[PDB]
Amino acid sequence: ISRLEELYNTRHGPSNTLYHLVRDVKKREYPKGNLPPDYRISLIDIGLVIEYLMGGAYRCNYTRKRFRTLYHNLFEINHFPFPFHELMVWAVLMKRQKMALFFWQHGEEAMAKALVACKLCKAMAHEASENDMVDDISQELNHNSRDFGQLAVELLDQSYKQDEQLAMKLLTYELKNWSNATCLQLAVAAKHRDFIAHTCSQMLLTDMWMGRLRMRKNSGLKVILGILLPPSILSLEFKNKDDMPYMTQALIPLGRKIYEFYNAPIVKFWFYTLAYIGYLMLFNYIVLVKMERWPSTQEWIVISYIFTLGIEKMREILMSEPGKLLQKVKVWLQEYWNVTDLIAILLFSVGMILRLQDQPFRSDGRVIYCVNIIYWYIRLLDIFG
Amino acid sequence: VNKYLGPYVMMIGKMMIDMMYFVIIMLVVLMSFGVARQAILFPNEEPSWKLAKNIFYMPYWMIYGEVFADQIDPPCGQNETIIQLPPCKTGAWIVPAIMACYLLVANILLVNLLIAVFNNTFFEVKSISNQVWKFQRYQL
Amino acid sequence: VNKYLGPYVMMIGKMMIDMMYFVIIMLVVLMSFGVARQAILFPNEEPSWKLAKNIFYMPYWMIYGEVFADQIDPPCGQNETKIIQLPPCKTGAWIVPAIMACYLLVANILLVNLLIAVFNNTFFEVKSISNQVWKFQRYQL
Amino acid sequence: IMTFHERPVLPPPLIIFSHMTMIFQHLCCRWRDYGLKLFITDDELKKVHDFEEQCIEEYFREKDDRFNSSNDERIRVTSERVENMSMRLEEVNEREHSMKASLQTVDIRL
Amino acid sequence: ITDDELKKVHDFEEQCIEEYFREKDDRFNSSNDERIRVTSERVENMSMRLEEVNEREHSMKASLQTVDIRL
Numbered sequence: 001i002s003r004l005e006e007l008y009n010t011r012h013g014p015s016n017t018l019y020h021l022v023r024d025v026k027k028r029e030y031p032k033g034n035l036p037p038d039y040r041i042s043l044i045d046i047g048l049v050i051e052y053l054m055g056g057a058y059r060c061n062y063t064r065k066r067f068r069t070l071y072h073n074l075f076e077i078n079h080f081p082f083p084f085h086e087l088m089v090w091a092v093l094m095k096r097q098k099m100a101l102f103f104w105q106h107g108e109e110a111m112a113k114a115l116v117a118c119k120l121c122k123a124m125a126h127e128a129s130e131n132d133m134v135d136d137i138s139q140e141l142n143h144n145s146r147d148f149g150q151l152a153v154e155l156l157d158q159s160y161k162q163d164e165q166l167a168m169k170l171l172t173y174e175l176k177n178w179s180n181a182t183c184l185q186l187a188v189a190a191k192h193r194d195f196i197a198h199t200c201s202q203m204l205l206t207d208m209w210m211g212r213l214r215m216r217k218n219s220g221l222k223v224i225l226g227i228l229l230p231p232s233i234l235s236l237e238f239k240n241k242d243d244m245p246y247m248t249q250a251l252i253p254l255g256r257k258i259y260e261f262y263n264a265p266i267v268k269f270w271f272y273t274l275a276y277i278g279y280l281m282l283f284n285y286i287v288l289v290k291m292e293r294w295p296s297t298q299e300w301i302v303i304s305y306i307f308t309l310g311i312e313k314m315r316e317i318l319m320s321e322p323g324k325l326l327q328k329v330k331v332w333l334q335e336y337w338n339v340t341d342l343i344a345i346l347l348f349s350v351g352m353i354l355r356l357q358d359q360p361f362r363s364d365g366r367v368i369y370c371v372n373i374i375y376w377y378i379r380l381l382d383i384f385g
Numbered sequence: 386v387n388k389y390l391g392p393y394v395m396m397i398g399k400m401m402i403d404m405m406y407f408v409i410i411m412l413v414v415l416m417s418f419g420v421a422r423q424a425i426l427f428p429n430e431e432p433s434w435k436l437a438k439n440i441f442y443m444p445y446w447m448i449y450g451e452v453f454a455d456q457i458d459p460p461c462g463q464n465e466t467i468i469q470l471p472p473c474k475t476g477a478w479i480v481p482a483i484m485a486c487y488l489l490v491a492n493i494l495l496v497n498l499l500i501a502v503f504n505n506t507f508f509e510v511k512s513i514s515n516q517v518w519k520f521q522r523y524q525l
Numbered sequence: 526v527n528k529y530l531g532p533y534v535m536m537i538g539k540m541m542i543d544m545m546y547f548v549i550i551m552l553v554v555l556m557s558f559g560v561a562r563q564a565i566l567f568p569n570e571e572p573s574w575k576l577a578k579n580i581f582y583m584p585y586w587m588i589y590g591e592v593f594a595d596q597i598d599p600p601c602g603q604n605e606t607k608i609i610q611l612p613p614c615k616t617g618a619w620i621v622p623a624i625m626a627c628y629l630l631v632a633n634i635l636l637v638n639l640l641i642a643v644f645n646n647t648f649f650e651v652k653s654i655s656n657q658v659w660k661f662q663r664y665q666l
Numbered sequence: 667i668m669t670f671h672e673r674p675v676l677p678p679p680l681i682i683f684s685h686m687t688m689i690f691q692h693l694c695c696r697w698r699d700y701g702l703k704l705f706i707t708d709d710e711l712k713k714v715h716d717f718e719e720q721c722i723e724e725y726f727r728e729k730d731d732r733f734n735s736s737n738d739e740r741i742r743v744t745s746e747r748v749e750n751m752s753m754r755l756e757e758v759n760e761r762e763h764s765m766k767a768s769l770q771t772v773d774i775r776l
Numbered sequence: 777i778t779d780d781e782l783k784k785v786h787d788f789e790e791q792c793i794e795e796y797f798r799e800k801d802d803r804f805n806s807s808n809d810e811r812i813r814v815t816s817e818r819v820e821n822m823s824m825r826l827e828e829v830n831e832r833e834h835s836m837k838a839s840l841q842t843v844d845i846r847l
């Protein structure tokens with residue numbers, strides 16, 4: 001631990017942006033300011049730098065309570081079990097690309113280390129452009145991110161050539177040295193488009209799509225007749241109990257088949273789509289036919305769909321990555337389809353309120369219904385996605 | 386059987402798939418405009434199958450150069466030499482605006498995008514159709 | 526004789542052949558729609574050459590943005606205002622707008638865009654050949 | 667895929683029943699994380715691990731073989747050699763000229 | 777066809793097989809990759825043999841100088 005702190009606190013070698021990153025996270029933690037010119041940078045300070053660069057719900061081993069206890073109790077227990085991970089993170093941060101490539105060869109979790117280094121090097125490239133630093137630093141950090149991304153793609157090629165099944169276990173197993181994450185998740189957080197679009201990741205995503213179902217023949221039709229006819233579920237070949245258990249947090253055969261069918265992502269998608277088509281077909285009927293003073297049965301089902309969708313979008317805001325409520329709202333509105341969803345639900349609210357009054361507000365309520373039905377056909381392109 | 390008409394025919398059969406994807410997207414946009422126009426311009430309607438016909442009737446012929454100019458924005462809500470033009474349905478000014486958006490999207494976006502997908506898949510389809518026709522000469 | 530108009534003219538002469546193949550396919554589709562429409566909407570007709578004219582007349586102008594909107598689905602079999610009684614509907618007159626829709630889709634969307642693709646992907650070879658042929662025919666001129 | 671894996675099982679209307687369980691569960695389990703991983707056992711974790719080292723060695727080795735099979739490098743590494751024989755054969759030529767002179771003088775003495 | 781034309785067809789077929797196979801071998805042996813590879817290997821052997829020639833020539837020149845000293 002003490003030798004690695006001496007490595008992080010060196011003044012030799014090439015220039016770096018690590019001192020600016022430590023300064024920003026001490027300003028965020030204790031709003032002080034500029035660090036003293038003699039501030040020994042602890043590994044707790046390095047772990048907080050990894051937090052701001054990774055983003056999301058990451059939790060580095062430095063900031064956990066096990067490491068903070070030892071650090072106070074000491075400043076082979078002080079030896080690192082996997083030292084080349086620490087040398088990778090160190091060589092990435094002060095921008096030593098040739099040493100980082102050497103440390104990717106030696107050690108292990110190369111697929112994890114290359115995706116972590118890709119997400120790190122992209123993050124300090126954005127941070128250097130944000131603080132108006134030298135633009136040559138931001139270009140070279142983007143070049144280091146592209147090199148580590150290209151290393152992860154070419155390693156994924158080699159695993160897929162050797163053994164197809166062991167490549168999926170490489171992509172999905174829990175990474176205990178990287179906040180219990182997944183090699184599939186780390187590519188997504190790094191926004192690495194070539195990794196996910198590779199064929200090995202695509203068949204992995206297809207296996208995740210079917211859930212606990214073998215099937216894979218004449219896709220779509222077999223799960224539609226499963227949804228409409230519940231006794232058509234039992235006549236389909238299900239997947240074995242320990243074939244590929246992607247699990248979240250670790251008469252009787254008939255009930256297990258029903259529960260495994262209704263929890264598959266392809267079955268949940270087709271049940272969502274058939275509910276949306278039935279809703280849209282009802283919402284055609286209530287604007288084409290005239291409406292009375294009170295809503296009909298078909299209009300009440302439509303109003304119930306807008307309310308349950310609005311509650312569902314509210315739950316998606318609450319059950320998200322950040323902690324602050326304004327941060328949860330902001331990250332939910334980066335998606336453009338979530339912005340137009342909230343606008344259209346608010347227009348249905350004011351249109352239904354106007355419709356429930358008398359004339360001439362009932363005619364104003366119908367006009368907002370007709371503008372809303374323009375939107376719900378356009379959102380039917382999400383199903384086509 | 387002809388050396389030029391045969392590859393042309395199977396080439397048309399190859400572009401039928403791109404045409405079908407254009408038909409699906411155009412069906413979505415056409416139905417949205419037709420339902421909005423019919424539901425705004427006719428507020429008091431009984432349940433009848435003519436509503437489903439009026440969804441598809443005029444917006445389909447808008448694609449082929451017939452905009453039905455007499456019914457775009459009919460003069461309404463005033464006297465005119467003397468008859469009384471009928472009173473204006475609420476929101477009837479929305480119909481030319483969504484007409485403008487629909488005509489733009491259809492005639493400018495989707496037809497030209499289909500031109501692009503016909504153009505950029507032409508060479509592979511042409512070579513495959515030539516080779517497939519030369520293969521099917523034996524069966525003929 | 527002009528350096529730019531001459532190659533343009535022989536290029537038009539080259540695209541004659543692709544137009545002729547388009548005209549053959551369009552003639553088949555046009556002739557099918559015209560025969561179907563004329564035979565459905567006019568059941569009791571004597572042998573006359575006007576039937577052959579009615580096969581080709583309005584389906585040909587439907588390609589160029591004139592769909593004859595007053596005659597797509599004429600109203601019939603009802604009374605519309607003095608009260609006027611409209612003539613009764615011929616059997617299967619609802620088929621004519623449906624096959625009109627299919628015909629207009631096939632011709633204007635499929636075949637014209639296909640001819641755009643044929644004209645476009647054979648442009649470069651025809652352009653180079655026509656430029657060299659014009660430079661060769663300068664001597665004959 | 668991960669959005670539809672997280673969505674309640676019931677559709678928007680029947681999502682009211684699902685949200686009821688969700689809050690009933692909140693008002694129950696409390697009164698009483700994201701992603702689809704694989705949670706490997708330590709034995710298959712090692713087997714996955716050595717699989718990754720076979721791949722990382724085979725990638726680097728291959729890159730080196732495709733570098734040397736490179737015509738570009740079969741030409742560079744030829745030139746270096748050619749020069750080292752060019753100076754060495756010139757030294758052979760000068761030394762053998764001296765050897766012939768010494769042999770001729772030895773024959774004249776004999 | 778008749779048996780004798782079967783014989784001519786088979787002989788023609790063997791001629792075509794030999795033509796295709798050894799023109800494939802000639803196309804492989806005259807390519808830039810194969811020519812440059814063979815030149816590389818032959819130059820490796822040439823440099824090793826010439827280094828051995830250098831050592832033996834130095835030894836023989838020293839022996840001839842000693843023989844001239846003896847005379």
Ligand SMILES: CC(C)CCC[C@@H](C)[C@H]1CC[C@H]2[C@@H]3CC=C4C[C@@H](OC(=O)CCC(=O)O)CC[C@]4(C)[C@H]3CC[C@]12C
Pocket residue numbers: 274277278279281282285298
């Ligand atoms: C699975 C997906 C593809 C479709 C699921 C939805 C359909 C089964 C629904 C949506 C629209 C519904 C129609 C909407 C309106 C009406 C009018 C309704 O008649 C009345 O309201 C007046 C007479 C009466 O009160 O019975 C009779 C049912 C019906 C045809 C409904 C039948 C069932 C439909 C087709």
Ligand SMILES: CC(C)CCC[C@@H](C)[C@H]1CC[C@H]2[C@@H]3CC=C4C[C@@H](OC(=O)CCC(=O)O)CC[C@]4(C)[C@H]3CC[C@]12C
Pocket residue numbers: 275276278279282297298301679
């Ligand atoms: C989950 C949602 C989005 C789709 C569900 C599809 C069907 C299960 C729904 C859609 C349309 C519904 C129909 C819409 C209208 C009516 C008329 C309704 O007639 C009356 O209520 C007449 C008596 C009265 O006026 O009270 C009886 C139910 C029924 C057939 C409904 C039965 C259930 C249907 C078929």
Ligand SMILES: CC(C)CCC[C@@H](C)[C@H]1CC[C@H]2[C@@H]3CC=C4C[C@@H](OC(=O)CCC(=O)O)CC[C@]4(C)[C@H]3CC[C@]12C
Pocket residue numbers: 394395396397398399401554557558561623624625627628631
């Ligand atoms: C009178 C009105 C309704 C016009 C009729 C429209 C359709 C009934 C016709 C017009 C163009 C025809 C198409 C023209 C070309 C072909 C290719 C040909 O298919 C093949 O040669 C098989 C190989 C292949 O599809 O590539 C025959 C079917 C198809 C799609 C035809 C199917 C029938 C179509 C769509």
Ligand SMILES: CC(C)CCC[C@@H](C)[C@H]1CC[C@H]2[C@@H]3CC=C4C[C@@H](OC(=O)CCC(=O)O)CC[C@]4(C)[C@H]3CC[C@]12C
Pocket residue numbers: 408411412415438441442445598599600601618619620622623626630
């Ligand atoms: C998205 C695009 C590529 C295709 C979508 C358009 C078609 C599905 C629509 C456009 C015109 C429609 C037709 C317009 C008129 C009629 C006549 C109608 O018959 C009547 O109204 C009876 C006679 C009368 O009342 O005058 C039956 C439906 C039909 C064939 C319609 C069927 C559906 C059509 C072909």
Ligand SMILES: CC(C)CCC[C@@H](C)[C@H]1CC[C@H]2[C@@H]3CC=C4C[C@@H](OC(=O)CCC(=O)O)CC[C@]4(C)[C@H]3CC[C@]12C
Pocket residue numbers: 277280281282284285288416432433434436437
């Ligand atoms: C995503 C897209 C494809 C949805 C398109 C839906 C509409 C084109 C459909 C769905 C429900 C249909 C309605 C369902 C039931 C009826 C009642 C029906 O009434 C009668 O036939 C009269 C009853 C009688 O007197 O017997 C007239 C058609 C209508 C309004 C239908 C018109 C067309 C609608 C709106």
Ligand SMILES: CC(C)CCC[C@@H](C)[C@H]1CC[C@H]2[C@@H]3CC=C4C[C@@H](OC(=O)CCC(=O)O)CC[C@]4(C)[C@H]3CC[C@]12C
Pocket residue numbers: 408409412434435437438441
């Ligand atoms: C999905 C793509 C590839 C093909 C397009 C299919 C639909 C858009 C078509 C096929 C069948 C059509 C239907 C066929 C028959 C009728 C009856 C028709 O009824 C009348 O015209 C009643 C008479 C009148 O009062 O005018 C109204 C249109 C409708 C629902 C059509 C609406 C458009 C539909 C659903």
Ligand SMILES: CC(C)CCC[C@@H](C)[C@H]1CC[C@H]2[C@@H]3CC=C4C[C@@H](OC(=O)CCC(=O)O)CC[C@]4(C)[C@H]3CC[C@]12C
Pocket residue numbers: 534535536537538539541
């Ligand atoms: C007023 C109405 C009747 C329209 C008249 C249409 C046709 C009689 C004209 C219009 C354009 C003409 C074409 C324009 C260009 C050429 C190229 C030119 O031919 C050449 O230069 C020979 C080399 C070659 O064909 O490439 C003269 C014939 C041709 C096919 C012309 C043939 C007659 C066309 C088809």
Ligand SMILES: CC(C)CCC[C@@H](C)[C@H]1CC[C@H]2[C@@H]3CC=C4C[C@@H](OC(=O)CCC(=O)O)CC[C@]4(C)[C@H]3CC[C@]12C
Pocket residue numbers: 548551552555578581582585
């Ligand atoms: C497939 C495409 C590229 C070409 C096919 C269309 C032509 C062969 C058609 C379309 C319009 C037709 C013309 C439309 C009208 C007439 C007028 C007609 O003369 C009369 O009817 C006499 C005067 C009268 O009775 O009013 C003679 C046929 C003619 C020239 C037709 C000849 C055939 C034409 C040129």
Ligand SMILES: CC(C)CCC[C@@H](C)[C@H]1CC[C@H]2[C@@H]3CC=C4C[C@@H](OC(=O)CCC(=O)O)CC[C@]4(C)[C@H]3CC[C@]12C
Pocket residue numbers: 572573574576577
């Ligand atoms: C594959 C394609 C090219 C076939 C196209 C067929 C039609 C365009 C032709 C074939 C037979 C023709 C018919 C042959 C005979 C007659 C009788 C003729 O009668 C008269 O001239 C009146 C006789 C008299 O009173 O003297 C009128 C045209 C007509 C209906 C013709 C109309 C056009 C038809 C249907």
Ligand SMILES: CC(C)CCC[C@@H](C)[C@H]1CC[C@H]2[C@@H]3CC=C4C[C@@H](OC(=O)CCC(=O)O)CC[C@]4(C)[C@H]3CC[C@]12C
Pocket residue numbers: 548549552574575576577578581
């Ligand atoms: C094959 C491609 C490349 C060229 C197109 C050729 C045909 C489609 C054209 C050429 C000559 C045309 C014919 C020329 C003259 C007449 C007489 C004309 O008779 C009338 O109009 C009679 C008067 C009336 O009653 O209106 C009907 C169309 C017809 C048969 C035409 C039908 C279409 C034809 C066969």
